[PDB]
PDB file of C-alpha atoms and ligand atoms in Angstrom:
ATOM      1  CA  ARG A  23       1.942 -17.212 -16.212  1.00 43.09           C
ATOM      2  CA  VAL A  24       3.630 -14.917 -14.070  1.00 45.20           C
ATOM      3  CA  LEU A  25       3.819 -11.259 -12.821  1.00 43.78           C
ATOM      4  CA  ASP A  26       7.379  -9.949 -11.447  1.00 43.39           C
ATOM      5  CA  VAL A  27       5.896  -7.843  -8.436  1.00 39.62           C
ATOM      6  CA  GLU A  28       8.493  -5.214  -6.708  1.00 41.58           C
ATOM      7  CA  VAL A  29       6.654  -2.889  -4.080  1.00 41.53           C
ATOM      8  CA  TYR A  30       8.875  -0.935  -2.087  1.00 42.08           C
ATOM      9  CA  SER A  31       7.595   1.587   1.600  1.00 41.84           C
ATOM     10  CA  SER A  32      10.022   3.647   3.294  1.00 36.72           C
ATOM     11  CA  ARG A  33       9.832   7.227   4.770  1.00 33.10           C
ATOM     12  CA  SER A  34      10.625   8.920   1.976  1.00 33.48           C
ATOM     13  CA  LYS A  35      10.360   6.684  -0.955  1.00 33.04           C
ATOM     14  CA  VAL A  36       7.981   4.068  -2.625  1.00 32.28           C
ATOM     15  CA  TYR A  37       7.715   2.676  -5.741  1.00 28.97           C
ATOM     16  CA  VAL A  38       6.249  -0.447  -7.369  1.00 26.23           C
ATOM     17  CA  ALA A  39       7.705  -2.068 -10.588  1.00 27.86           C
ATOM     18  CA  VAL A  40       5.592  -4.946 -12.923  1.00 27.12           C
ATOM     19  CA  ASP A  41       7.892  -7.508 -14.670  1.00 27.86           C
ATOM     20  CA  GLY A  42      11.231  -5.106 -14.585  1.00 25.37           C
ATOM     21  CA  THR A  43       8.866  -1.741 -15.450  1.00 21.17           C
ATOM     22  CA  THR A  44       8.325   0.765 -12.236  1.00 21.40           C
ATOM     23  CA  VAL A  45       4.297   1.998 -12.902  1.00 20.79           C
ATOM     24  CA  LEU A  46       4.688   3.939  -9.537  1.00 20.57           C
ATOM     25  CA  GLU A  47       7.606   6.231  -7.918  1.00 20.76           C
ATOM     26  CA  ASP A  48       7.686   8.964  -5.856  1.00 20.65           C
ATOM     27  CA  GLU A  49      10.421  10.455  -3.534  1.00 19.10           C
ATOM     28  CA  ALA A  50       9.076  13.598  -4.262  1.00 19.44           C
ATOM     29  CA  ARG A  51      10.077  15.563  -0.682  1.00 20.68           C
ATOM     30  CA  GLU A  52       6.743  17.285   0.548  1.00 22.29           C
ATOM     31  CA  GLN A  53       3.891  15.318  -1.301  1.00 21.53           C
ATOM     32  CA  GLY A  54       3.110  11.232  -1.557  1.00 22.75           C
ATOM     33  CA  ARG A  55       2.419  10.887   1.875  1.00 20.10           C
ATOM     34  CA  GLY A  56      -0.053   7.686   2.789  1.00 17.13           C
ATOM     35  CA  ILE A  57      -1.159   4.286   1.462  1.00 19.10           C
ATOM     36  CA  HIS A  58      -0.181   3.966  -2.464  1.00 19.24           C
ATOM     37  CA  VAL A  59      -2.631   1.788  -4.289  1.00 19.31           C
ATOM     38  CA  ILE A  60      -1.935   0.103  -7.235  1.00 19.09           C
ATOM     39  CA  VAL A  61      -4.874  -2.453  -9.083  1.00 16.55           C
ATOM     40  CA  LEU A  62      -3.739  -4.519 -12.065  1.00 17.44           C
ATOM     41  CA  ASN A  63      -5.581  -6.547 -14.222  1.00 18.42           C
ATOM     42  CA  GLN A  64      -5.189 -10.092 -13.421  1.00 16.28           C
ATOM     43  CA  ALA A  65      -4.591 -11.430 -16.911  1.00 17.10           C
ATOM     44  CA  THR A  66      -2.265  -9.145 -18.438  1.00 14.36           C
ATOM     45  CA  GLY A  67      -0.745  -6.931 -15.404  1.00 13.04           C
ATOM     46  CA  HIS A  68      -1.891  -3.735 -16.941  1.00 10.91           C
ATOM     47  CA  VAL A  69      -2.542  -1.010 -14.501  1.00 10.18           C
ATOM     48  CA  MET A  70      -6.310   0.070 -13.971  1.00 10.03           C
ATOM     49  CA  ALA A  71      -5.822   2.172 -11.070  1.00 12.14           C
ATOM     50  CA  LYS A  72      -3.536   4.443  -9.130  1.00 12.56           C
ATOM     51  CA  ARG A  73      -4.410   6.431  -6.254  1.00 12.21           C
ATOM     52  CA  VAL A  74      -2.613   7.378  -3.315  1.00 12.31           C
ATOM     53  CA  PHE A  75      -4.979   8.059   0.175  1.00 15.53           C
ATOM     54  CA  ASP A  76      -3.105  10.446   2.894  1.00 15.44           C
ATOM     55  CA  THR A  77      -4.046   7.935   5.893  1.00 17.68           C
ATOM     56  CA  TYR A  78      -2.237  10.408   8.090  1.00 20.98           C
ATOM     57  CA  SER A  79      -5.020  13.003   7.783  1.00 18.13           C
ATOM     58  CA  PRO A  80      -8.715  12.525   8.452  1.00 13.23           C
ATOM     59  CA  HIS A  81     -11.248  11.247   5.758  1.00 13.32           C
ATOM     60  CA  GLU A  82      -8.588   9.818   3.432  1.00  9.48           C
ATOM     61  CA  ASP A  83      -9.427   6.482   4.861  1.00 13.20           C
ATOM     62  CA  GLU A  84     -12.937   6.699   4.054  1.00 11.66           C
ATOM     63  CA  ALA A  85     -11.810   7.754   0.390  1.00 12.90           C
ATOM     64  CA  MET A  86      -9.651   4.373   0.387  1.00 10.04           C
ATOM     65  CA  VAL A  87     -13.157   2.242   1.591  1.00  9.93           C
ATOM     66  CA  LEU A  88     -15.148   3.291  -0.630  1.00 12.91           C
ATOM     67  CA  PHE A  89     -12.198   2.605  -4.288  1.00  8.64           C
ATOM     68  CA  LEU A  90     -11.473  -0.253  -2.664  1.00  6.64           C
ATOM     69  CA  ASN A  91     -14.976  -1.775  -2.579  1.00  6.39           C
ATOM     70  CA  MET A  92     -15.745  -0.594  -6.090  1.00  7.65           C
ATOM     71  CA  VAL A  93     -12.483  -2.874  -7.104  1.00 10.85           C
ATOM     72  CA  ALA A  94     -13.411  -6.319  -8.796  1.00 12.41           C
ATOM     73  CA  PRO A  95     -12.566  -9.722  -6.930  1.00 10.38           C
ATOM     74  CA  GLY A  96      -9.787 -10.850  -8.523  1.00  7.02           C
ATOM     75  CA  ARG A  97      -7.762  -8.059  -9.662  1.00  7.25           C
ATOM     76  CA  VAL A  98      -4.344  -7.926  -8.055  1.00 11.50           C
ATOM     77  CA  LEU A  99      -4.320  -5.035  -5.219  1.00 13.11           C
ATOM     78  CA  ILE A 100      -1.460  -3.485  -4.321  1.00 16.33           C
ATOM     79  CA  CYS A 101      -0.755  -1.098  -1.116  1.00 17.69           C
ATOM     80  CA  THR A 102       2.813   0.688  -0.113  1.00 16.66           C
ATOM     81  CA  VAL A 103       3.296   3.354   2.440  1.00 16.39           C
ATOM     82  CA  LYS A 104       5.177   6.474   2.268  1.00 16.83           C
ATOM     83  CA  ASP A 105       6.224   8.459   5.440  1.00 15.66           C
ATOM     84  CA  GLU A 106       3.238   7.549   7.590  1.00 17.00           C
ATOM     85  CA  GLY A 107      -0.323   5.717   6.674  1.00 17.78           C
ATOM     86  CA  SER A 108      -1.963   4.943   9.950  1.00 15.87           C
ATOM     87  CA  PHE A 109      -3.047   7.486  12.297  1.00 16.10           C
ATOM     88  CA  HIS A 110      -6.399   8.153  10.529  1.00 19.26           C
ATOM     89  CA  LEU A 111      -6.532   4.622   9.307  1.00 15.82           C
ATOM     90  CA  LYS A 112      -9.573   3.319  10.977  1.00 16.05           C
ATOM     91  CA  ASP A 113     -11.481   0.835  12.149  1.00 15.72           C
ATOM     92  CA  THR A 114     -13.562   0.658   9.124  1.00 13.56           C
ATOM     93  CA  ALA A 115     -10.589   0.762   6.933  1.00 11.03           C
ATOM     94  CA  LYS A 116      -8.572  -1.732   8.710  1.00  8.85           C
ATOM     95  CA  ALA A 117     -11.525  -4.420   8.821  1.00  6.44           C
ATOM     96  CA  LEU A 118     -11.457  -3.763   5.241  1.00  7.71           C
ATOM     97  CA  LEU A 119      -7.445  -4.896   4.647  1.00 11.83           C
ATOM     98  CA  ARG A 120      -8.454  -7.643   7.217  1.00 14.45           C
ATOM     99  CA  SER A 121     -10.843  -9.168   5.136  1.00 13.59           C
ATOM    100  CA  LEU A 122      -8.183  -9.237   2.353  1.00 14.28           C
ATOM    101  CA  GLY A 123      -5.991 -11.821   4.055  1.00 13.42           C
ATOM    102  CA  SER A 124      -3.568  -8.364   5.153  1.00 14.58           C
ATOM    103  CA  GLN A 125      -1.599  -9.060   8.427  1.00 12.68           C
ATOM    104  CA  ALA A 126       0.238  -6.049   8.713  1.00 10.85           C
ATOM    105  CA  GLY A 127      -2.842  -3.870   7.351  1.00 15.83           C
ATOM    106  CA  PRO A 128      -5.071  -3.967  10.561  1.00 15.87           C
ATOM    107  CA  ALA A 129      -2.200  -3.879  12.570  1.00 21.35           C
ATOM    108  CA  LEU A 130      -0.116  -0.387  11.286  1.00 21.58           C
ATOM    109  CA  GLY A 131       0.913   1.850  12.944  1.00 20.62           C
ATOM    110  CA  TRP A 132       2.913   5.373  13.729  1.00 19.45           C
ATOM    111  CA  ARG A 133       5.177   5.530  10.979  1.00 21.05           C
ATOM    112  CA  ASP A 134       5.348   1.759   9.819  1.00 23.87           C
ATOM    113  CA  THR A 135       6.359   0.723   6.441  1.00 26.07           C
ATOM    114  CA  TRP A 136       4.050  -1.742   4.553  1.00 26.33           C
ATOM    115  CA  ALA A 137       3.990  -3.458   1.491  1.00 28.30           C
ATOM    116  CA  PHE A 138       1.301  -5.555   0.047  1.00 26.14           C
ATOM    117  CA  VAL A 139       0.093  -7.639  -2.953  1.00 28.30           C
ATOM    118  CA  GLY A 140      -3.300  -9.680  -2.952  1.00 27.17           C
ATOM    119  CA  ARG A 141      -5.747 -10.949  -5.234  1.00 26.74           C
ATOM    120  CA  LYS A 142      -8.867  -8.833  -4.136  1.00 27.19           C
ATOM    121  CA  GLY A 143     -11.007 -11.488  -3.583  1.00 26.33           C
ATOM    122  CA  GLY A 144      -8.010 -13.360  -2.052  1.00 24.65           C
ATOM    123  CA  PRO A 145      -5.140 -14.858  -1.138  1.00 25.32           C
ATOM    124  CA  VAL A 146      -2.747 -12.982  -0.244  1.00 22.62           C
ATOM    125  CA  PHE A 147       0.572 -13.240  -2.540  1.00 25.87           C
ATOM    126  CA  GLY A 148       3.232 -11.103  -0.537  1.00 28.06           C
ATOM    127  CA  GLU A 149       3.487  -9.097   2.395  1.00 26.79           C
ATOM    128  CA  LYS A 150       6.118  -7.048   4.518  1.00 27.42           C
ATOM    129  CA  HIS A 151       5.929  -4.712   7.609  1.00 26.78           C
ATOM    130  CA  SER A 152       8.631  -2.806   9.416  1.00 27.88           C
ATOM    131  CA  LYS A 153       7.290  -1.563  12.736  1.00 30.27           C
ATOM    132  CA  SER A 154       8.874   1.474  13.645  1.00 29.35           C
ATOM    133  CA  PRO A 155      10.952   1.548  16.768  1.00 32.92           C
ATOM    134  CA  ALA A 156       9.891   4.933  18.596  1.00 35.60           C
ATOM    135  CA  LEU A 157       7.571   7.822  17.627  1.00 33.46           C
ATOM    136  CA  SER A 158      10.770   9.770  16.651  1.00 34.68           C
ATOM    137  CA  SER A 159      11.722   7.014  14.269  1.00 35.16           C
ATOM    138  CA  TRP A 160      10.224   5.020  10.929  1.00 35.33           C
ATOM    139  CA  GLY A 161      10.070   1.601  10.332  1.00 34.87           C
ATOM    140  CA  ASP A 162      13.222   0.428   7.788  1.00 38.58           C
ATOM    141  CA  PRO A 163      12.560   0.542   3.861  1.00 36.44           C
ATOM    142  CA  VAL A 164      11.136  -2.901   2.917  1.00 35.82           C
ATOM    143  CA  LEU A 165      11.395  -4.532  -0.517  1.00 36.04           C
ATOM    144  CA  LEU A 166       8.613  -7.164  -1.127  1.00 31.86           C
ATOM    145  CA  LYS A 167       9.650  -9.008  -4.394  1.00 32.94           C
ATOM    146  CA  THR A 168       6.565 -11.508  -5.442  1.00 30.15           C
ATOM    147  CA  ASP A 169       5.749 -13.894  -8.222  1.00 28.57           C
ATOM    148  CA  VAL A 170       1.803 -12.962  -8.539  1.00 27.43           C
ATOM    149  CA  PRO A 171      -0.145 -15.744 -10.870  1.00 29.27           C
ATOM    150  CA  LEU A 172      -1.322 -14.723 -13.629  1.00 26.99           C
ATOM    151  CA  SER A 173      -4.807 -15.850 -14.992  1.00 25.10           C
ATOM    152  CA  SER A 174      -5.606 -17.005 -18.500  1.00 25.64           C
ATOM    153  CA  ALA A 175      -8.098 -17.921 -21.293  1.00 28.76           C
TER     154      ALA A 175
HETATM  155  C1  LIG B 463      10.397  17.247   8.041  1.00 29.12           C
HETATM  156  C2  LIG B 463       9.271  16.750   7.506  1.00 29.12           C
HETATM  157  O1  LIG B 463       9.322  15.314   7.738  1.00 29.12           O
HETATM  158  N1  LIG B 463       8.464  17.678   7.280  1.00 29.12           N
HETATM  159  C3  LIG B 463       7.295  17.149   6.266  1.00 29.12           C
HETATM  160  C4  LIG B 463       5.740  16.852   7.214  1.00 29.12           C
HETATM  161  O2  LIG B 463       5.913  15.598   7.930  1.00 29.12           O
HETATM  162  C5  LIG B 463       5.138  15.475   8.843  1.00 29.12           C
HETATM  163  C6  LIG B 463       4.973  13.587   8.431  1.00 29.12           C
HETATM  164  O3  LIG B 463       4.052  13.068   7.826  1.00 29.12           O
HETATM  165  C7  LIG B 463       4.544  13.245   9.683  1.00 29.12           C
HETATM  166  C8  LIG B 463       3.955  11.635  10.010  1.00 29.12           C
HETATM  167  O4  LIG B 463       5.434  11.318  10.248  1.00 29.12           O
HETATM  168  O5  LIG B 463       4.982  13.625  10.990  1.00 29.12           O
HETATM  169  C9  LIG B 463       4.957  14.810  11.305  1.00 29.12           C
HETATM  170  O6  LIG B 463       6.110  15.488  12.596  1.00 29.12           O
HETATM  171  C10 LIG B 463       5.409  15.087  13.583  1.00 29.12           C
HETATM  172  C11 LIG B 463       6.339  15.346  15.003  1.00 29.12           C
HETATM  173  C12 LIG B 463       5.455  15.529  16.192  1.00 29.12           C
HETATM  174  C13 LIG B 463       4.160  14.976  16.068  1.00 29.12           C
HETATM  175  N2  LIG B 463       4.080  14.913  17.440  1.00 29.12           N
HETATM  176  O7  LIG B 463       2.754  14.429  17.466  1.00 29.12           O
HETATM  177  O8  LIG B 463       4.896  15.615  18.356  1.00 29.12           O
HETATM  178  C14 LIG B 463       3.988  14.796  15.601  1.00 29.12           C
HETATM  179  C15 LIG B 463       4.188  14.662  13.971  1.00 29.12           C
HETATM  180  C16 LIG B 463       6.254  15.910  10.124  1.00 29.12           C
HETATM  181  N3  LIG B 463       5.738  17.410  10.182  1.00 29.12           N
HETATM  182  C17 LIG B 463       7.019  17.848  10.914  1.00 29.12           C
HETATM  183  C18 LIG B 463       6.788  19.143  10.819  1.00 29.12           C
HETATM  184  O9  LIG B 463       7.780  17.248  11.230  1.00 29.12           O
HETATM  185  O10 LIG B 463       4.718  16.283   6.538  1.00 29.12           O
HETATM  186  C19 LIG B 463       4.644  17.915   5.636  1.00 29.12           C
HETATM  187  C20 LIG B 463       3.360  16.542   4.729  1.00 29.12           C
HETATM  188  O11 LIG B 463       4.034  15.967   3.949  1.00 29.12           O
HETATM  189  C21 LIG B 463       5.838  17.886   4.858  1.00 29.12           C
HETATM  190  O12 LIG B 463       6.089  16.707   3.660  1.00 29.12           O
HETATM  191  C22 LIG B 463       7.112  18.082   4.978  1.00 29.12           C
HETATM  192  O13 LIG B 463       8.385  18.098   4.461  1.00 29.12           O
END
């Protein structure tokens, strides 16, 4: 009646594991920057969608907002940052993350790392965030492990 969810955010690598199986992994040297989003079915844990939005670059946050607004309430929503996710994560996107209950997402800054697991329509199940200490540095890798309650019947 639970999912064991692991979410990793760092400068050079992201991954998400569900019940000990890796369902998302990106350690490619020159791609995959931004906020990785995975959507799970809330009863089975099956992956319903996988996206990456390069919110270091303009317009990607707009795509993220349009995608997240079509996600059903009650899906499991997982986010994790590779390299940089904040430069063009602008106010509408930050307000949407705030509306999910995220604490770190609306506050995300330059080269911060961030891992998030929540029910789309509330509540938040797990969140971690490491602030970058300097413009030339990155946040510390963060590894969030969270038991997510499953729906039944
Ligand atoms: C060497 C390297 O990391 N290059 C990769 C490049 O990395 C981008 C990086 O995504 C962004 C965000 O962290 O930062 C760029 O670096 C700077 C450096 C200085 C400033 N400044 O305002 O003074 C801003 C950004 C970095 N680019 C460089 C040249 O270091 O990203 C591309 C696309 O992902 C490749 O991955 C490349 O490998």
